[PDB]
């Protein structure tokens, strides 16, 4: 509900950062977003709000390597 | 397929214990992931034991030095589980099942979960088939049957690991899949065990599950439950060994005292209330959970079995300590190894006077049952007559006769290392000893007499060995066909030699 | 009457309820799982505002910190009736045999009940017919009184209890309740079921006439602690109906250990050597419901595992405080194949007095003890002296004592597995007659090994003449 | 028997090696794929997708 | 970086850091301390709100709360390489000898490294000749295998270690590393410097082939707690490049004791006798790095102090499972002036197997233990009643056992000050021959007084003949 976090490989999304900040009001209200780079992460989908997360950019790849191995 | 996964933040990480803050809807023994971050390319799993309010203290299965405050953790819904199947035979693995021998990935298709309820109440069956340990003392006086829990308890260095490894080695063609779980054992010692098993070709039916001393207390805590899961799957589904479907498993817990110490460490770091000797309250519960899973399923449930051989070291032979008494109460038998007997030449070093096998005769071949009663009685009488042997000189040849015969039998049990004897061998030797055919042999030469008689029996007459082995299961073992051609061989050896 | 789980630390669960609907002290909690299976947790402490600390009595490997909890209002209710007869239960009264569940029409009773009042105590004490010669003679078995089989390992405690159940179910018309307190699954499950489904009445089986409650060693400490009270409730139902009942508790030592574990897990301060503070009262709550009421009597036979030879250990000490008769098993006797390995000496009973058992019983039972105390001081002399005959009449006394010692052994019907001998039952009148005749002199002129495994002195004579 | 066991172990080693190398080269492929044409709203669309 | 001290509990310093710049678990944080010299603390536990708990590894008795703490961001890194040979170091790797500091170009390695994997373990083992009769016969040392000498306070652990160094540290075929943790700064070092600089293998002293880290008892708990790891980091570099390393760690028990003190200050719940709950884990972390791997071999030779004469104490109890050859020193034997003081019955070895050490060696050792056992069994019988009530063969075995007890005594080159006799180097073959002859019956006529402080059996025979 609060203390949001959105990490992606390519940072500096400019307005998109602000668009994310205003659109994360979907659940409850105000959030405090913090952005990270994490260069080893190939693609950015990590969004955390409260005690939930969603990410399938490194983790689609992780599911792939679990499938093959 | 992106999906929401509940997460929490690490708020306090200490000596292998991490407090995870908000992990609502987390189950009481989940695997928490600690996903990779900068400076760590892997994931360090952990077990969420303490589900406290506004805090989940989880023990870490690995090095915690990479886990930092504020790090993220994902509550994977899966309970702790290990890979299990045919592919593990002859592979050294950690409790998580990842191979550590560097021979390649473990090939598997099923992953049984560790921490399973015992097989059942009415699903078991009376232990009848023997586990031929290959040691005369164990196989004759403290027999071990398939599905029995037999503790190997002793001092710091008496032969507990040696006894267990000899047991494992003797199951060459006996349709048994041994499992050796090393808990808190130094890595080079597990390497020595693996080298010994590979030298005798015993690594083609053995699984080694090692959690060594440096590995975190969490890994050692789950060390016996892993491997126990492998034995459970072997007894329930079976694995193909030598072209035959083997549904019998033997699991050796290298040292349950070290397992209890690891559980004490992880309990005290979680600030759980102590107990006797600073052990947690549910340590008997831990070991009973572990050891009640070893059973002998009835024919309705597969007919398989899982034999457990817990090992415990006692400080100064203090049997009355907490963990030794717990596992003595749990197990269906005890094998007491003493340093006083070990140094005195009794190389197996078993204390037959106190060692007990509650399965008793039911875990023996009918030949062993028919032959070993006189042995046990005579040894008990000799043990009763102790002082008289050693400096009373005014005894008749009634006390002294028992002293002599008991010394004969005790010297008979002295056996070297890595030289197991099949069932027919022990039957023949004990038949010779208990039918007065060995009386004239002097005391110090009895080990050589036994060895020479066996060599004569391998070479001079293999037909008598085959004859003994074929009809070791009949109710009246000393059949006239067997009594003849066995007494005849004994007489031939007596006349030819000495 | 619904709360939520707050903390889960091992097998101890802390649950918060509404302020006005807090469960009572020993109420059930009944955490519901997915498939209709549930987790009954017993409350142990009411603390704070609506918070209750409860012991799991189950795995607690599948629980979250928000699961609803369904307070039952009453303690752990257990089936009691004719329908609980011939079945196998766990601590919670749920059947663990393969048969179907107990129907709702069967009465359920709370596991915790007050013992009979001091007025209801029946002071009239009479011997309970056992069947085993050494037990019937040396340590007579009271009706409605507690007896304990003491000993270490491979001593025969469980097998002796098994024989007692089989004999008193067959020859008497006696029901029995078995309390598997900390029960080994190998021993308790498929050696008690198997050898009581083999012990057979006429068109009826001994298993069908007995109740079995197994709190196995794999279950948490709470289950092992309260399985004894479950079995007590089962037996107390039949006692209330007027039937004489024979309760059996296997290794009350493990009951004490379970109590110690529960107390340690609950945060109570340790007492003596780490044991629970509520040791004596925990044992009393169990041992005082076993007594002879005017209407009926629960006769009990407890097994006690003494570590090493330490009788100062808390479990044997508390039992001894709560006992009427004591039976001591020795490994030395057992290793000589005297398989009912009771030690005649160091096996006492308060019933063994002239008034209760009888003048002849007391005389013939006190002679054997003396005769045998003489042999303990002369077995060893004949060992050292190398001279059996250097004895004016102590050579006769030694022979008679050896015959007596061999005579105490008896083939058990439940031991047909071990030795393959039919089980012989010996009434107490036959026991006193046999030992009186042996002491008279009839036992002479018969060599040893004819007294080895025989029921009566008549059986010994029949074996001799043949 | 041990020769065949080591043969299948070598096969498993090779399968693990090729499976891991597939991903290790796909890392370069996807990194360069996102390097040049990294201006895709699909990412942001996935962020808002939930 | 740039934290502040919150609390100062003994040598456990609690420091608060910025929320996003907290140190890792084993990073080394520094208090400036003024005067141009710093106090290096090692983090142990990350508490809440950037709060960490660090072990001082120094005096920490003149520093206030709120003092600045600087996070180095890396664990305690110590120099490694040939530059460390012939030098003497602190727990921190700072040299404490008169020579200059180690230059920046020398590689620095963390002291907290993972131990060798299971695949890297070296199972090969062969006898290591020491020249000491009781050690070479009853518990033969392994080349590349861990061994430890257990003993109380007065028994001769350090003298055994010193004689061992004087015996085997000349023919090294490699380098060596010494680690006197929590040991006396008198004998533990600065008296071993004298002998290590007095010994000259070949134009170079034994000291010139030795790395040396002390952390003596005078030091606070942190130094004694991490000096073992510093020494192991020094030795591991040489092991990894193939050089055979001789590792002498002194009183591993003070490592465990310093761990216990630090744990008590850290707020952990005590385990057993006031010991840290993480006793086994710390012990394993130290000892699994003491291993001979495939790349190179480490011939470790430890010493262990048992509280008083207690052998069931948790520290030696955890040590016993971490060894290939165990040696037990008894107070009673030392009080009898049988000063090597090794108890043959309580001393064992893994390579006491006829395939490795030889069939005759194994037979003689096992017979010398059987005979020793017989005497321990008859000890009370002899004590109260007397020697005459035993049978003839029991009497003979008792006399032979007493002769064997006296014969394990051996003068040492380093112990020449106590016993005036010069030191004797007895090869293992001569030890086996001597004890085989003693058991065979030879030397029965000799009084037991002539087996005291002698070399091989030939010296005993010569002494008897000189006495006629
Ligand atoms: N017949 C024998 N049986 C057992 N051990 C023997 C025998 N003969 C020699 N030994 C030696 O005795 C020692 C037995 O110890 P082992 O390695 O089996 O472990 P342990 O006594 O259980 O103790 P730990 O593993 O804690 O050191 C080994 O040195 C073994 O080589
Ligand atoms: N007739 C008998 N009565 C009792 N025990 C017997 C008898 N015959 C053999 N035994 C031995 O007793 C064992 C059972 O011991 P048990 O009484 O179950 O446990 P405990 O050691 O606690 O008494 C059997 O497996 C066997 O070894
Ligand atoms: N070979 C020996 N000859 C004579 N005395 C010895 C010998 N070895 C040890 N000692 C005695 O042991 C004492 C030193 O013991 P030490 O090695 O310092 O043990 P610790 O280090 O445990 O104190 C000396 O006083 C000395 O008398
Ligand atoms: Mg071992
Ligand atoms: Mg029992």
PDB file of C-alpha atoms in Angstrom, chain C residues 263-370:
ATOM      1  CA  UNK C 263       6.880 -27.708  30.105  1.00  0.00           C
ATOM      2  CA  UNK C 264      10.203 -26.761  28.511  1.00  0.00           C
ATOM      3  CA  UNK C 265       8.467 -25.662  25.305  1.00  0.00           C
ATOM      4  CA  UNK C 266       5.873 -23.649  27.244  1.00  0.00           C
ATOM      5  CA  UNK C 267       8.539 -21.473  28.884  1.00  0.00           C
ATOM      6  CA  UNK C 268       8.011 -22.790  32.409  1.00  0.00           C
ATOM      7  CA  UNK C 269      11.017 -22.601  34.695  1.00  0.00           C
ATOM      8  CA  UNK C 270      12.872 -25.937  34.921  1.00  0.00           C
ATOM      9  CA  UNK C 271      12.627 -27.997  38.098  1.00  0.00           C
ATOM     10  CA  UNK C 272      15.224 -30.338  39.613  1.00  0.00           C
ATOM     11  CA  UNK C 273      17.371 -31.584  36.670  1.00  0.00           C
ATOM     12  CA  UNK C 274      15.540 -29.691  33.950  1.00  0.00           C
ATOM     13  CA  UNK C 275      12.241 -31.526  34.497  1.00  0.00           C
ATOM     14  CA  UNK C 276       8.859 -29.833  34.661  1.00  0.00           C
ATOM     15  CA  UNK C 277       7.763 -27.907  37.766  1.00  0.00           C
ATOM     16  CA  UNK C 278       4.373 -29.650  37.635  1.00  0.00           C
ATOM     17  CA  UNK C 279       5.781 -33.173  37.762  1.00  0.00           C
ATOM     18  CA  UNK C 280       4.125 -34.636  40.844  1.00  0.00           C
ATOM     19  CA  UNK C 281       0.751 -33.081  40.061  1.00  0.00           C
ATOM     20  CA  UNK C 282       0.916 -34.141  36.408  1.00  0.00           C
ATOM     21  CA  UNK C 283       1.541 -37.714  37.522  1.00  0.00           C
ATOM     22  CA  UNK C 284      -1.181 -37.440  40.157  1.00  0.00           C
ATOM     23  CA  UNK C 285      -3.822 -36.239  37.700  1.00  0.00           C
ATOM     24  CA  UNK C 286      -3.218 -39.489  35.792  1.00  0.00           C
ATOM     25  CA  UNK C 287      -2.570 -41.944  38.629  1.00  0.00           C
ATOM     26  CA  UNK C 288      -5.446 -40.877  40.911  1.00  0.00           C
ATOM     27  CA  UNK C 289      -8.192 -41.616  38.386  1.00  0.00           C
ATOM     28  CA  UNK C 290      -6.984 -45.245  38.583  1.00  0.00           C
ATOM     29  CA  UNK C 291      -8.639 -46.521  41.751  1.00  0.00           C
ATOM     30  CA  UNK C 292     -11.205 -48.983  43.083  1.00  0.00           C
ATOM     31  CA  UNK C 293     -14.603 -47.293  43.283  1.00  0.00           C
ATOM     32  CA  UNK C 294     -17.595 -48.984  44.892  1.00  0.00           C
ATOM     33  CA  UNK C 295     -19.287 -49.435  41.508  1.00  0.00           C
ATOM     34  CA  UNK C 296     -16.179 -50.511  39.601  1.00  0.00           C
ATOM     35  CA  UNK C 297     -12.398 -50.499  39.584  1.00  0.00           C
ATOM     36  CA  UNK C 298      -9.691 -49.617  37.068  1.00  0.00           C
ATOM     37  CA  UNK C 299      -6.774 -51.952  37.712  1.00  0.00           C
ATOM     38  CA  UNK C 300      -3.542 -50.635  36.216  1.00  0.00           C
ATOM     39  CA  UNK C 301      -0.226 -52.200  35.150  1.00  0.00           C
ATOM     40  CA  UNK C 302       2.400 -49.603  34.218  1.00  0.00           C
ATOM     41  CA  UNK C 303       5.787 -50.214  32.575  1.00  0.00           C
ATOM     42  CA  UNK C 304       8.714 -48.051  33.675  1.00  0.00           C
ATOM     43  CA  UNK C 305      12.016 -47.847  31.809  1.00  0.00           C
ATOM     44  CA  UNK C 306      14.783 -47.102  34.311  1.00  0.00           C
ATOM     45  CA  UNK C 307      17.860 -45.586  32.589  1.00  0.00           C
ATOM     46  CA  UNK C 308      20.842 -47.736  33.614  1.00  0.00           C
ATOM     47  CA  UNK C 309      19.963 -48.638  37.250  1.00  0.00           C
ATOM     48  CA  UNK C 310      19.007 -45.080  38.284  1.00  0.00           C
ATOM     49  CA  UNK C 311      15.886 -45.389  40.452  1.00  0.00           C
ATOM     50  CA  UNK C 312      16.536 -41.821  41.663  1.00  0.00           C
ATOM     51  CA  UNK C 313      15.496 -40.702  38.164  1.00  0.00           C
ATOM     52  CA  UNK C 314      12.288 -38.627  38.409  1.00  0.00           C
ATOM     53  CA  UNK C 315       9.949 -40.964  36.512  1.00  0.00           C
ATOM     54  CA  UNK C 316      10.608 -44.113  38.599  1.00  0.00           C
ATOM     55  CA  UNK C 317      10.581 -41.990  41.759  1.00  0.00           C
ATOM     56  CA  UNK C 318       7.173 -40.453  41.073  1.00  0.00           C
ATOM     57  CA  UNK C 319       5.740 -43.797  39.980  1.00  0.00           C
ATOM     58  CA  UNK C 320       7.054 -45.414  43.180  1.00  0.00           C
ATOM     59  CA  UNK C 321       5.276 -42.676  45.098  1.00  0.00           C
ATOM     60  CA  UNK C 322       2.092 -43.690  43.235  1.00  0.00           C
ATOM     61  CA  UNK C 323       2.473 -47.509  43.283  1.00  0.00           C
ATOM     62  CA  UNK C 324       0.947 -50.420  45.175  1.00  0.00           C
ATOM     63  CA  UNK C 325       3.016 -53.337  43.822  1.00  0.00           C
ATOM     64  CA  UNK C 326       6.464 -53.365  42.216  1.00  0.00           C
ATOM     65  CA  UNK C 327       7.801 -55.888  39.697  1.00  0.00           C
ATOM     66  CA  UNK C 328      11.501 -55.647  38.837  1.00  0.00           C
ATOM     67  CA  UNK C 329      12.881 -57.186  35.644  1.00  0.00           C
ATOM     68  CA  UNK C 330      16.598 -57.940  35.362  1.00  0.00           C
ATOM     69  CA  UNK C 331      18.732 -58.398  32.269  1.00  0.00           C
ATOM     70  CA  UNK C 332      20.869 -61.034  33.995  1.00  0.00           C
ATOM     71  CA  UNK C 333      17.813 -63.228  34.563  1.00  0.00           C
ATOM     72  CA  UNK C 334      16.568 -62.683  31.006  1.00  0.00           C
ATOM     73  CA  UNK C 335      19.898 -63.591  29.386  1.00  0.00           C
ATOM     74  CA  UNK C 336      19.638 -67.013  31.070  1.00  0.00           C
ATOM     75  CA  UNK C 337      16.388 -67.585  29.127  1.00  0.00           C
ATOM     76  CA  UNK C 338      14.226 -67.244  32.261  1.00  0.00           C
ATOM     77  CA  UNK C 339      12.087 -65.095  30.061  1.00  0.00           C
ATOM     78  CA  UNK C 340       9.443 -63.941  32.545  1.00  0.00           C
ATOM     79  CA  UNK C 341      12.520 -62.304  33.993  1.00  0.00           C
ATOM     80  CA  UNK C 342      11.087 -61.042  37.267  1.00  0.00           C
ATOM     81  CA  UNK C 343      13.510 -60.846  40.153  1.00  0.00           C
ATOM     82  CA  UNK C 344      11.803 -62.627  43.091  1.00  0.00           C
ATOM     83  CA  UNK C 345      13.765 -60.482  45.516  1.00  0.00           C
ATOM     84  CA  UNK C 346      13.384 -56.741  44.921  1.00  0.00           C
ATOM     85  CA  UNK C 347       9.817 -57.403  43.699  1.00  0.00           C
ATOM     86  CA  UNK C 348       7.438 -56.266  46.431  1.00  0.00           C
ATOM     87  CA  UNK C 349       3.717 -55.818  46.971  1.00  0.00           C
ATOM     88  CA  UNK C 350       1.478 -54.521  49.742  1.00  0.00           C
ATOM     89  CA  UNK C 351      -1.077 -57.261  49.042  1.00  0.00           C
ATOM     90  CA  UNK C 352       1.455 -59.941  50.048  1.00  0.00           C
ATOM     91  CA  UNK C 353       0.284 -60.189  53.652  1.00  0.00           C
ATOM     92  CA  UNK C 354      -1.459 -63.079  55.446  1.00  0.00           C
ATOM     93  CA  UNK C 355      -4.805 -61.292  55.715  1.00  0.00           C
ATOM     94  CA  UNK C 356      -5.496 -60.652  52.022  1.00  0.00           C
ATOM     95  CA  UNK C 357      -3.953 -63.429  49.935  1.00  0.00           C
ATOM     96  CA  UNK C 358      -4.183 -66.013  52.729  1.00  0.00           C
ATOM     97  CA  UNK C 359      -2.036 -67.740  55.336  1.00  0.00           C
ATOM     98  CA  UNK C 360      -0.826 -70.458  52.964  1.00  0.00           C
ATOM     99  CA  UNK C 361      -0.077 -67.950  50.201  1.00  0.00           C
ATOM    100  CA  UNK C 362       1.942 -65.750  52.553  1.00  0.00           C
ATOM    101  CA  UNK C 363       3.853 -68.701  54.015  1.00  0.00           C
ATOM    102  CA  UNK C 364       4.682 -70.343  50.683  1.00  0.00           C
ATOM    103  CA  UNK C 365       5.600 -66.970  49.143  1.00  0.00           C
ATOM    104  CA  UNK C 366       7.873 -65.973  52.043  1.00  0.00           C
ATOM    105  CA  UNK C 367       9.639 -69.342  52.091  1.00  0.00           C
ATOM    106  CA  UNK C 368      10.706 -69.087  48.417  1.00  0.00           C
ATOM    107  CA  UNK C 369      12.170 -65.580  49.043  1.00  0.00           C
ATOM    108  CA  UNK C 370      14.239 -66.875  52.013  1.00  0.00           C
TER     109      UNK C 370
END
